[PDB]
Ligand SMILES: *[C@@H]1O[C@H](CO)[C@@H](O[C@@H]2O[C@H](CO)[C@@H](O[C@@H]3O[C@H](CO[C@H]4O[C@H](CO)[C@@H](O)[C@H](O)[C@@H]4O)[C@@H](O)[C@H](O[C@H]4O[C@H](CO)[C@@H](O)[C@H](O)[C@@H]4O)[C@@H]3O)[C@H](O)[C@H]2NC(C)=O)[C@H](O)[C@H]1NC(C)=O
C-alpha cells in the first residue's frame with residue numbers, strides 16, 4: 090500500500106449514546122408548568138433525515154422520562170408552596186347527612202377567638218376526604234389528621250397542562266424514529282435528527298391515556314415482552330374515543346377565618362338537585378376502537394381469547410379511572426367500558442389527593458364555584474394481564490390498569506433518543522507534514 | 526444498660542422518641558483502657574517533654 | 577436528469593457515506609457543533625470545557641484553525657493494513673472510528689510525545705542557530 | 706552504569722534544575738496544568754478565565770500554539786547583565802522568575818505596545834502594497 094500518515098480531522102459526524110438534560114421550551118406567554126423561565130420555541134424548526142445511517146431505539150431506556158418526572162414534581166411543589174395549612178381544621182366534625190350520602194353537612198367550634206374573628210362556620214365535606222370516628226356518632230375528621238399536615242392549594246394556581254417542548258443542548262442531538270411499525274425497541278431504519286421536540290402536555294391520569302398522540306393509521310400495541318406477566322401493554326389508538334365529562338352540581342363556596350390574617354375556603358351550599366358526576370362516552374367510537382385492538386391482540390394472544398372484563402386490582406384510585414377535569418379530581422368506574430367481554434360512567438369526586446404519591450405534605454383542592462364541563466378523548470390506554478392460566482386460548486383478561494404515572498410521558502417519548510456527538514477524529518493520508 | 530424506647534404522640538402527624546424502660550441493673554458508662562499501653566506511651570512522651 | 581438538494585448536508589447524514597464524500601461538509605458539521613437558570617448555567621460551563629478541550633489538543637498538535645491537518649506521525653499498519661483507497665473510498669466515518677477505536681489514545685499520545693516534543697525542541701534550536 | 710526513570714518529569718520537579726534542562730518538559734508541564742455542585746461550578750468558571758487569559762496574551766504576542774516563541778523585543782541589560790550561558794546553564798526557573806519579577810509588567814507591556822503594534826500596522830501596509 091501507500092505509505093500512510095496520520096491526519097487529524099475535525100467535524101467528524103459520529104456519535105455515541107449519552108444521557109443529559111434537555112432545555113425546556115414553551116410558547117411563551119401561576120400555572121404549574123407555565124414557568125417564568127423557559128426558552129421560546131422555534132417558529133421554523135428543522136428536521137433532516139440521515140438515511141445512510143440507522144439507529145437502535147429502545148423506549149424503555151429513554152431517561153428523559155426521569156427528567157420530566159422530577160422537574161414536574163418540583164414545579165408543582167414550588168407553585169403551591171405558600172399555601173394554607175389545614176392543621177387547625179383537624180377539629181372533629183359533627184356531621185349529618187346532607188338532604189337531597191356522599192356529602193355531609195357538619196359543624197365544629199375552632200379557633201374560638203384565638204386573637205381573631207372566627208366562628209363554628211358549618212360547611213359541606215366529602216366522604217372521600219374524611220375518616221370516620223367509629224367511637225363517636227359516627228363523627229368525622231380530616232383523613233390527614235393521623236398522617237401529615239396538608240395544605241389547601243393556592244386559588245391563584247391553574248392546573249391546565251402546558252405543551253412544553255424540549256430541545257438539545259450544545260454538543261448533543263435528538264434522533265427520532267419515524268418507522269410507523271416501531272414498537273418497544275429495534276434498529277429503526279427511518280431515523281432523522283430533530284432540533285427540538287414538539288410539546289407534550291403533562292396529562293396525569295390512570296387506566297386511559299387522554300389528549301395524546303394517535304397511532305400511524307392502525308392500532309399499535311407495544312410491550313417489553315408480551316409473554317411476561319410483570320410487564321404492561323401500551324395501546325396507541327388509531328383514532329380517539331370521544332368523552333364528555335360534567336359536574337352538574339352548581340356549587341358555591343365560602344371563605345372562613347381560621348386565624349389572624351388567615352383564610353380557608355369551604356364548600357358552600359349547592360344550588361339545584363345534587364347529582365352524580367359522570368362522563369358520557371360514545372359507544373360507537375369505543376366499540377369500534379376495541380374491534381381494532383382485539384384484532385391486533387389476536388396476533389400475540391390467540392384468535393378466540395376472551396378479553397376485557399370489569400375493573401379490578403389496586404386501591405380505589407387504581408381501580409377507578411382518574412382525571413382532573415376543571416381542577417377537581419374525578420374517579421370514575423371504567424367498568425362500564427369493560428362490562429362486557431369479547432356509555433355513562435358513574436363517578437365520585439375527591440379533594441385530598443396525592444400527586445402520583447405524596448409523603449407527608451399533600452394537596453387539598455379548593456372548592457370550585459359553579460359547574461365543571463370539559464371535553465377530551467381517549468388516545469391510548471394501558472392493559473394489564475390477570476396472571477397465570479391455562480395455556481389454551483380461552484381467556485386473557487386485559488383489565489385496565491397502571492399506576493406508574495411515568496408511563497404518561499414515556500408513551501410519547503418512545504419516538505426520541507439523545508446522543509453525544511464527537512467531532513474529533515483521525516484517519517490515514519498519503520503524505521508527511523512538511524516539517525522543518 | 527439495655528435500654529428500650531417509646532414513640533409518643535406530640536401533635537397531629539407528629540411523634541417524638543422518649544427513653545423507655547431499662548432491662549437489667551442500671552450501671553455506669555465506662556471505658557476500659559490498657560494501663561500497660563497507656564503508661565508506656567506516657568514514658569515516651571515524658572522523654573520528649575524533657576527536651 | 578438529476579434532482580438536487582438545496583445547498584449542503586443538513587446534519588450528520590454523511591456519517592454513513594464514505595469518509596471521502598463526507599469530508600466535503602466538515603466545515604458545515606464543525607460550525608454546527610461548535611456553536612432552570614442554574615441547570616442551564618451548569619450546561620453552559622460544560623459546553624465551554626468541551627469546546628476548549630478540543631481546542632487545546634488542536635493547538636498542541638499544530639492543527640488549530642484547520643479542520644484537516646497532516647501530522648508527521650507514520651501510520652503503523654498493525655492498526656489497519658488497508659490501503660488509502662480501501663479506507664477512504666470504501667468506509668464510513670462511523671465504521672472507521674470503530675475499527676481503530678482502541679488506538680485513539682495511542683496515536684494521540686504519539687502525536688504529542690513524539691512530534692510536538694520534536695517540533696518544540698527543534699524550533700528553539702533553529703531560532704537560536 | 707546508569708539508572709533511569711520511566712519516561713519524563715512527573716510534575717514540577719524540574720523547577721529547581723537549570724532552566725536549560727527544565728525546558729525539556731514544557732510540553733509535559735503545560736498539558737498537565739492546562740487540563741458542592743455550585744462551589745465546583747464557580748471553580749470551573751474561574752479555571753476557564755485563567756485558561757483563556759493566558760491564551761489571550763499568547764494570541765496577541767504571536768505565540769499561540771507555541772510553548773517557546775521568540776519575540777522581537779530586545780533585552781535591556783539593566784534588568785540583568787548576565788550572559789545567555791550565565792542564566793540558562795546556571796539558574797533555575799524559580800530563581801530566575803524572582804530575579805526579574807519586577808520587570809514582568811514592563812516587558813509584557815513592551816511586547817504589546819511596541820512589537821504587536823508594529824506587526825499589525827506594518828502587516829496591513831504590506832498587504833495593501
Ligand atoms: C383535553 O384538551 C381539551 C382541549 O384543550 C381540554 O378541554 C378544555 O379545557 C379548558 C381548561 O381551561 C377549558 O377552558 C375553560 O373554558 C371556560 C368556558 O369556556 C367557554 O369560554 C371560553 C372563554 O375564552 C372559550 O374559549 C371557550 O371556547 C368556551 O366558549 C372558561 O371560562 C375558562 O376560563 C376560566 O377558568 C380558568 C381556570 O383556570 C381561569 O383561569 C380563567 O381566568 C377563567 O376564570 C377556561 O378557559 C375548555 O373549555 C375545555 N374545552 C371544552 C370543550 O370544554 C380538556 O380538559 C383536556 N383533557 C385533559 C385530560 O387534560
Ligand SMILES: *[C@@H]1O[C@H](CO)[C@@H](O[C@@H]2O[C@H](CO)[C@@H](O)[C@H](O)[C@H]2NC(C)=O)[C@H](O)[C@H]1NC(C)=O
Nearest residue numbers: 145268269270271272273274275276277312313
Ligand atoms: C417489534 O418488536 C419485536 C419484538 O421485540 C422486534 O423483533 C426483535 O427485535 C430485536 C431488536 O434488537 C431483535 O434482537 C430480535 O431478534 C427481534 N425478534 C424477532 C423474532 O424478529 C421487532 O423488530 C419490532 N418491530 C419494529 C418495527 O421495531
Ligand SMILES: *[C@@H]1O[C@H](CO)[C@@H](O)[C@H](O)[C@H]1NC(C)=O
Nearest residue numbers: 181182183184225226228229
Ligand atoms: C352533634 O350535635 C347533636 C345535637 O343534638 C349533639 O347531640 C351531639 O352530641 C353532637 N355531637 C358531637 C360530636 O358533639
Ligand SMILES: *[C@@H]1O[C@H](CO)[C@@H](O)[C@H](O)[C@H]1NC(C)=O
Nearest residue numbers: 305306307308327328381384
Ligand atoms: C385506521 O383509521 C383509518 C381512518 O380512516 C381507517 O381508514 C383505517 O382502516 C384504520 N385502520 C385499521 C387497521 O382499520
Ligand SMILES: *[C@@H]1O[C@H](CO)[C@@H](O)[C@H](O)[C@H]1NC(C)=O
Nearest residue numbers: 300303328329330464465466
Ligand atoms: C381529540 O381531542 C382534541 C381536542 O382539541 C381534538 O383537537 C382532536 O381532533 C381529537 N381527536 C380526534 C381523533 O377527534
Ligand SMILES: *[C@@H]1O[C@H](CO)[C@@H](O)[C@H](O)[C@H]1NC(C)=O
Nearest residue numbers: 339340360361458459460461
Ligand atoms: C349557580 O346558581 C346561582 C343561583 O343564583 C346562579 O346565579 C349561578 O349562575 C349558577 N351557576 C352556574 C354555573 O350555573
Ligand SMILES: *[C@@H]1O[C@H](CO)[C@@H](O)[C@H](O)[C@H]1NC(C)=O
Nearest residue numbers: 662663665666667668671672
Ligand atoms: C469494500 O468494498 C466491497 C466491494 O464489494 C464491499 O463488499 C465491502 O463491504 C466494502 N467495505 C465496506 C467497509 O463497506
Ligand SMILES: *[C@@H]1O[C@H](CO)[C@@H](O)[C@H](O)[C@H]1NC(C)=O
Nearest residue numbers: 791792794795796797800801
Ligand atoms: C553560578 O555558578 C557558580 C559556580 O560556582 C555558583 O557558585 C553559583 O551559585 C551559580 N549561580 C546560581 C544561580 O546558582
